[PDB]
Design a protein around this ligand. Structure first.
Ligand code: HEM
Length: 182
């Protein structure tokens, strides 16, 4: 089942409110045709260059950042082009991205919330319609809607009374979330 980690700072927030606010602040990195600048709005893979166990991206305007973890593959110019696919196990949100391929991995200096055991598996043939792609490209674009939808389904599968409209404290009482120090 989904497992959620959250700083006690967010104990009284709903998941939906936290994610809406986090993504709005992160913003859109404008990873779109004509606007991609390597080292500015591409993010990076570990070990990379275009595959690995992590993909991480910091905002173009502040130190907010996220890390996607799993077994990830990116097609770049190969068909179907510009698709992230593979197995997505986790999304960690916070600020101050540390590490990189030269460090052996990425980590957030201030991890606010993480969602693990996501169990999302997207074949390459689904291209940009795959869930893995939509979740991560959404986050790159400042839009947590796809992530919210996947969390909501995982929470309902535990119990239909649980949803993205539950608070982190409610999800902890329900056995799917645990707090970390502020
Ligand atoms: C090392 C990481 C990455 C690099 C170097 C990279 C590079 C690029 C480049 C060069 C373009 C084309 C810009 C243009 O046509 O002018 C592009 C577009 C795009 N990339 Fe990436 N990308 C990276 C990561 C990702 C990831 C992780 C995703 C998805 C989760 C993604 C999804 C897309 C999409 C959807 C487009 C737009 C394609 C279109 O509308 O034609 N990219 N990227």
């Amino acid at each position: 089942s989904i497992s959620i980690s959250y700083s006690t700072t967010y104990s009284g927030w709903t998941v939906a409110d936290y994610l809406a606010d986090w993504s709005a602040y992160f913003g859109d990195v404008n990873h779109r045709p004509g606007q991609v600048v390597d080292g500015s709005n591409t993010g990076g893979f570990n070990p990379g260059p275009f595959d690995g166990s992590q993909y991480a991206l910091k905002s173009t305007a502040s130190d907010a950042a996220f890390i996607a973890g799993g077994d990830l593959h990116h097609t770049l110019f190969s068909n179907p082009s510009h698709t992230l696919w593979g197995k997505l196990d986790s999304i960690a949100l916070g600020d101050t991205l540390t590490g990189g391929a030269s460090s052996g991995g990425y980590a957030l200096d201030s991890q606010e919330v993480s969602f693990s055991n996501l169990g999302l598996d997207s074949p390459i043939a689904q291209g940009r319609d795959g869930t893995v792609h939509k979740v991560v490209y959404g986050l790159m674009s400042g839009d947590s809607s796809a992530l919210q939808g996947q969390i909501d389904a995982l929470l309902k599968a535990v119990d239909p009374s649980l949803s993205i409209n539950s608070t982190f404290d409610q999800l902890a009482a329900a056995g799917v979330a645990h707090a970390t120090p502020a």
